[PDB]
Design an enzyme around this catalytic site. Sequence first.
Site, PDB file in Angstrom:
ATOM      1  N   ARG A  51       0.856  -1.203   0.000  1.00 31.52           N
ATOM      2  CA  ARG A  51       0.000   0.000   0.000  1.00 31.52           C
ATOM      3  C   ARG A  51       0.883   1.241   0.000  1.00 31.52           C
ATOM      4  O   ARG A  51       1.760   1.374   0.831  1.00 31.52           O
ATOM      5  CB  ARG A  51      -0.914   0.059   1.220  1.00 31.52           C
ATOM      6  CG  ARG A  51      -1.761   1.325   1.329  1.00 31.52           C
ATOM      7  CD  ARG A  51      -2.747   1.164   2.504  1.00 31.52           C
ATOM      8  NE  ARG A  51      -3.370   2.376   2.999  1.00 31.52           N
ATOM      9  CZ  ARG A  51      -2.885   3.135   3.975  1.00 31.52           C
ATOM     10  NH1 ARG A  51      -1.885   2.713   4.729  1.00 31.52           N
ATOM     11  NH2 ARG A  51      -3.383   4.340   4.166  1.00 31.52           N
TER      12      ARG A  51
ATOM     13  N   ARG B  54      -6.367  20.061   6.685  1.00 26.84           N
ATOM     14  CA  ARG B  54      -5.062  20.176   7.351  1.00 26.84           C
ATOM     15  C   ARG B  54      -5.037  21.437   8.226  1.00 26.84           C
ATOM     16  O   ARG B  54      -5.710  22.433   7.884  1.00 26.84           O
ATOM     17  CB  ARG B  54      -3.948  20.236   6.299  1.00 26.84           C
ATOM     18  CG  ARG B  54      -4.084  19.218   5.173  1.00 26.84           C
ATOM     19  CD  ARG B  54      -2.855  18.339   5.034  1.00 26.84           C
ATOM     20  NE  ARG B  54      -2.652  17.507   6.218  1.00 26.84           N
ATOM     21  CZ  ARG B  54      -2.039  16.326   6.220  1.00 26.84           C
ATOM     22  NH1 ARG B  54      -1.601  15.805   5.087  1.00 26.84           N
ATOM     23  NH2 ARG B  54      -1.882  15.667   7.357  1.00 26.84           N
TER      24      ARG B  54
ATOM     25  N   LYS C  54     -12.843   3.241   0.536  1.00 28.39           N
ATOM     26  CA  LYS C  54     -12.628   3.313   1.951  1.00 28.39           C
ATOM     27  C   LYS C  54     -13.806   4.032   2.589  1.00 28.39           C
ATOM     28  O   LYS C  54     -14.048   5.194   2.292  1.00 28.39           O
ATOM     29  CB  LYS C  54     -11.326   4.047   2.263  1.00 28.39           C
ATOM     30  CG  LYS C  54     -10.075   3.327   1.779  1.00 28.39           C
ATOM     31  CD  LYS C  54      -8.834   4.168   1.739  1.00 28.39           C
ATOM     32  CE  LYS C  54      -8.564   4.827   3.060  1.00 28.39           C
ATOM     33  NZ  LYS C  54      -7.178   5.349   3.097  1.00 28.39           N
TER      34      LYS C  54
ATOM     35  N   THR D 293      -6.466  -0.943  10.132  1.00 24.20           N
ATOM     36  CA  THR D 293      -6.040   0.040  11.106  1.00 24.20           C
ATOM     37  C   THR D 293      -5.994  -0.556  12.502  1.00 24.20           C
ATOM     38  O   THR D 293      -6.988  -1.078  12.980  1.00 24.20           O
ATOM     39  CB  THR D 293      -6.918   1.286  11.084  1.00 24.20           C
ATOM     40  OG1 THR D 293      -6.933   1.682   9.725  1.00 24.20           O
ATOM     41  CG2 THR D 293      -6.370   2.414  11.916  1.00 24.20           C
TER      42      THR D 293
END
Lengths: 529, 529, 532
Positions: B73, B120, B266, B324
């Site tokens: 990945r 961000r 996702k 995760t």
Amino acid sequence: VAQLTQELGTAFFQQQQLPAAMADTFLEHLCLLDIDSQPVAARSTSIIATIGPASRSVDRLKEMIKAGMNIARLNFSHGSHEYHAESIANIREATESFATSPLSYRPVAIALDTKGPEIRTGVLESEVEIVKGSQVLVTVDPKFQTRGDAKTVWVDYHNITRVVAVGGRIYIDDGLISLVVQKIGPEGLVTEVEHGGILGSRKGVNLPNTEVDLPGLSEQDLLDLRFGVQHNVDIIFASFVRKASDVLAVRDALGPEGQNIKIISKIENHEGVKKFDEILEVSDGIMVARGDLGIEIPAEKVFLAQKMMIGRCNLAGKPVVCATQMLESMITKARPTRAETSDVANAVLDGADCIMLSGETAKGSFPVEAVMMQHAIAREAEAAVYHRQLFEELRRAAPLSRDPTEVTAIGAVEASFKCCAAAIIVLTKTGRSAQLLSQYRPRAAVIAVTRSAQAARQVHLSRGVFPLLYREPPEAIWADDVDRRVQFGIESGKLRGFLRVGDLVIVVTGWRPGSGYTNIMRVLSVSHH
Amino acid sequence: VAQLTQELGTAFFQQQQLPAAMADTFLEHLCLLDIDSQPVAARSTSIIATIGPASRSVDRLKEMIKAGMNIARLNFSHGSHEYHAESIANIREATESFATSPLSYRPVAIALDTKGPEIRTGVLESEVEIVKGSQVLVTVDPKFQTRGDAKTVWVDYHNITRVVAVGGRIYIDDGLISLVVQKIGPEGLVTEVEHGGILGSRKGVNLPNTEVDLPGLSEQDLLDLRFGVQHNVDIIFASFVRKASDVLAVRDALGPEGQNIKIISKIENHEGVKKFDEILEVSDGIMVARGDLGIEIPAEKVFLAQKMMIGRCNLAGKPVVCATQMLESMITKARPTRAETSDVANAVLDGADCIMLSGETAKGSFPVEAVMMQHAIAREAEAAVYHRQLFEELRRAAPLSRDPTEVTAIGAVEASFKCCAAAIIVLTKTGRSAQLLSQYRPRAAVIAVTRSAQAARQVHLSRGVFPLLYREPPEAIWADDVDRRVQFGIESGKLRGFLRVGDLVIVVTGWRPGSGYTNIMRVLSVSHH
Amino acid sequence: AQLTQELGTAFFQQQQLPAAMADTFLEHLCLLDIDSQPVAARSTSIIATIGPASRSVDRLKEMIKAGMNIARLNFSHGSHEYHAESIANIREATESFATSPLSYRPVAIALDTKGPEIRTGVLQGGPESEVEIVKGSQVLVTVDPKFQTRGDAKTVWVDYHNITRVVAVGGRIYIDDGLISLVVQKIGPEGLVTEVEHGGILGSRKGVNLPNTEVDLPGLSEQDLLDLRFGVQHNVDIIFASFVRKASDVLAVRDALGPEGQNIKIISKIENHEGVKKFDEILEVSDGIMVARGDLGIEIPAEKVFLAQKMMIGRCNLAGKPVVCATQMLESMITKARPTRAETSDVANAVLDGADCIMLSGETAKGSFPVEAVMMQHAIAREAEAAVYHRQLFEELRRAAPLSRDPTEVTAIGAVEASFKCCAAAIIVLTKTGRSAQLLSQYRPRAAVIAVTRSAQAARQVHLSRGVFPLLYREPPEAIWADDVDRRVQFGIESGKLRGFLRVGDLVIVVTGWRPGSGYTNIMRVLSVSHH
Ligand SMILES: O=P(O)(O)OC[C@H]1O[C@](O)(COP(=O)(O)O)[C@@H](O)[C@@H]1O
Ligand SMILES: O=P(O)(O)OC[C@H]1O[C@](O)(COP(=O)(O)O)[C@@H](O)[C@@H]1O
Ligand SMILES: O=P(O)(O)OC[C@H]1O[C@](O)(COP(=O)(O)O)[C@@H](O)[C@@H]1O
């Protein structure tokens, strides 16, 4: 379902994973699970919290209890009698602080966890660094009892040279360090370090796939158990049970004076696993002690042993506890990992009666938050249980019975499914009557009204039993005394928010005083009086 | 079973959790699981490893591949094109280093993970401490883009003041810090810190339960996807898919020239969960991206969304990935926790086609050991799957079909159960034929022989498909070319230890060249020639 | 099932208990055992048709002892006074047992409607003149009234006026137990130009059927309107409403029974294709269903009837309403002492299908072995009741039934589940209307549902519901309601003891309510049978 949706409101069937409850396969069940479907039921999976420095203050305990701690674990692997006796006073002070209001008072059980067949290292003090790749020695030489370094470990099991094999492992300090033995002789062992951390002083050693001559109860244990009787503890967690006789030893120790104490045998090694059926038969229940178990057996196999033992205990109708590292990272952090969250949920879905905190509550930074996180995962997972399949499989497995309490209990649980009962209310002296309800895993909470303080404490071991301690003295007319205990179940239910006006309750009672005559199931509407 | 036990040996039925496979209920299945029952099958659950500093060297990759990494990945949330392009060369160097021996060569897929709708923080540099209880401000003021402190955060989503609510959360740096908003106005937000860690510079922000105007693909994404086409990547992991159109955007971008690339959406937030069915329908599969998901939704609910999406993908017959923190503690430690072990097992038992490492392989101290631990848990969990129930439920759910490849595939899987086949060997150009075998979850490995290098890579997404890349040029007689591909399946099987002389194999082929004519199932004995 | 130690090895041999413990239906079948003897309590009701062979008070008494529960009065034949003679005769036979009310068997009385008939005109005048018809022929069906008597071999008239409209080109016209078929070719102004298919001998005024045709008649003749009103007069428990075809036909019968007949139980007879097609709407507004296989097996191919039977029994089981299987179940026994191997099989399979009741027609009415017919049905039903696979039946009914907040429903499924856990000999229920007992019936417990009631009507009507054994309580209320409840329960148990249903040390489930009047059932107790 079309008719309760016109009566109870469309939204009643959006909660409690009820759309998933009504699915016809496990697969479809899984597909219908809904993150917006809110758990409504009370939390049925008991929480066990290890008491230590982070959870021993009377004020800390009060927040633990509020957060959902049901059982307090005293680990007698660390601490003296007077330290523990003080843990007990502080717990009973916290608990009994809510007696002020009987309708919201939460019994807290106290579980004594034995030291058990332990193997410790030497005085070695402070701390010394042990290094992967490097040659370490193990000796039984009484002179080295006081010495110890990156090259030599002492250990108090004299016959260690008689029980290991070449390529076998020696694990020290909750499995922190790993040594592979290469040479065996009468002086000691020659080992390579596979896993190298920092060694303290007088640490725990594990020897997987070995038979160690250490008898049922050490002298120290005999004493620790007699303390527990003296301090009226509710439960023994018996460390490192290896065979049935080990459990009988424990029962003998407690003798006549502690025969009502529950023995929960901790399965920690390949021997306990192999001898599981014979351990189960004489224990009151089981702990999957995944800490020791995950070094005694390969780590990638613990889930097999967990699911096995939980299944066999569900099938036997005896409580089973899942333990160790469930929320490990909350020792230092305020929020757990995705795998910790998973593990707690999967332990409930596996069928565990109880989940357990160790480090997280004993020593960590976030004792109360850990209890709160177990409580919140548990509620969600309980509603995601596929009752259709589970109840049917338990129905089938269970033998025919001519015992009225058994008969009554299964009719009541069936009844509760028919109407989505908010509760089954049951009168029990010993807890038995509530346990036989519990063993069919109803969705509906089992509210158990009892005068036995000790029963109210011990029934936390059985999934879905909410103990209410009844304090008022006998009405003169027995039938009246019954109604009032039942009415106390309802009012408590109302106040604690498990029951509301218009809810259906199944009410289980018996035809005369004493244990063993539960034989009656009624269907009532909660009312305004 | 009495007859194979006289033919194959008593001990054949002690392995692969075969005693538990033969149980008649799920409960009894669970009770019969045996820690001494050794997995024998090859590992069917693909392992995905995130490439980063700890796993980017050609020699590191070679050990990853040996350990069982199937898919690499590339996280385009960190790093430049030339950094990644170099990750790709190093991966293909490692992979192609085993081409020396075709019979043991393991295809490695390369998955490109988009940056996606990101928010961000400012240049704030080094690092500053943020404190629980304390008042922080969020501003969109371009002047503060360069300033930032324990009292002020900047963030690059201009309209943040238009999308939040009072009591909503703002999460920064993979959810490290939590702020609760108290006052909203056009200048910025006024927030109390709920969870206080140490803030870096230009970190990730999450705003649960908000609709953010950020379009399907940022300009940056358009580019990142065209890189992937240029570098021949096998898979896109599409970050933060919120609705179907988001997936169509991604497909359009890849345009004609990248139409054979697999899109794995996702699911990271409440929107993706709610719009799951419509996302599934146009994606090639799904990733339960539990990191973002466990801050976007309450953490105690992630397991519901996981089990839901895995179930719906099993039902749809499209690959699904669990991601995760599966082995988070192996970032710093060499052995995982009991809950990490549990989580990996439970993801396989849930029905996940793939499991994933992030930190553990990208940056941690133990990349190779993490891959080795996933590989070892996965093998154990795969054999503990209750195939009886699962196959029957998939059988039922699946529609009738007049497609010969579908018909053939279900007969073959049934056949493999009848005889405990060591393998199903299938010829496929595109992978489709192996996928339709895979969707019924046979115990028997699906060995897929293909000339499409790209297919051999992509089929790692489907549980139980072992791709073998066939390199020899066409025999003149087509039928001969078939036999030889089949014979290559067997020999590879033999060498890699999945097949032995005397094993039964189901062999699935078609009646002419090209995709779509698989229509034939044979039963063969592996032989000595 | 390790308990065996206390109730004895013997116990798990009998009742098909080994077959009950099977995990699969196939294993269940495999473990069925001819040496595993059934209990005395036979739960499927016997309806006996009352005619020439079953009118004598001595015979009725025998038929009651044999195990007859409902008596069917076929109002297609006999006169009003003929029938009142039957009714009075039945009551006398029934009430002759009231003398020992612990063994008193309530006997229901059902009125079988005549319903929409269609008859052929006279043949050339004479009421015994018997024409023949050839197969590859031409035949005429007319409206015109002069042909009433002018009945050729070429032409016949029939009661039902509106055939021109309702039968279409190609529809079939069966005559006399469908011995004679005609394919309708032309809808002329003359009538209906037909082509024979099967032939044979003729008569006058013999039954004709209209397969796949939606019969025009109103569903209550004047004769029905009159037979019904008589039914109300004589206190009949049940109507079997003939040729029900839609919901409105059932409402028409309820309308005609009026306020006085509100409590008569209406069992709609499904006799024709339109019946089967409208079945669900018929069932919504009926109290039950008869599968009238006689007429059904003319109005649709004979080979299709088992399908109609099985669908209707299943749909009724699902609905929790009684269903009757009717016609030719023991045909041979009309003339012979013993039935054919297909007849016993047909009875056993009706019970295994889920029939609440099985009926005898000519076998009891007009035939030479009416008592042994009853005895046959009685013996087969006990064997077949034990061969039911309750594990699967109880499981499917449970899953199919809706959630309810009705305490009676809740209590019932609880009781039934309890009965299964402990192999209860009985479920003893107090009911005023039957409802509480019916709600137990619906789950098909293996234990007998012993219903104690003061309602003579209810005790009779409750025979419709499989496994409900009605007891009639005569004693007037005790002073204290709770003591009155307990006395009914005791009656229930002592009643059982006398009849062999119950033996000391048996478990019973006892279902009761919290206060007087219907709808308050809410209590389930587990008790041992006493007086060791
Ligand atoms: O669960 P256990 O210990 O058998 O207790 C059940 C008993 O509690 C009761 O309901 C009430 O008993 P007491 O009034 O003796 O407390 C009994 O009728 C019944 O037999
Ligand atoms: O799985 P896919 O892509 O349909 O491929 C299946 C095809 O592979 C084959 O077995 C062999 O095809 P080629 O010889 O064209 O590779 C075909 O017979 C069959 O239709
Ligand atoms: O079956 P039904 O019609 O609801 O009758 C049930 C009633 O029978 C009883 O047991 C007794 O009532 P009665 O005294 O009115 O006969 C009630 O408690 C209960 O509601």
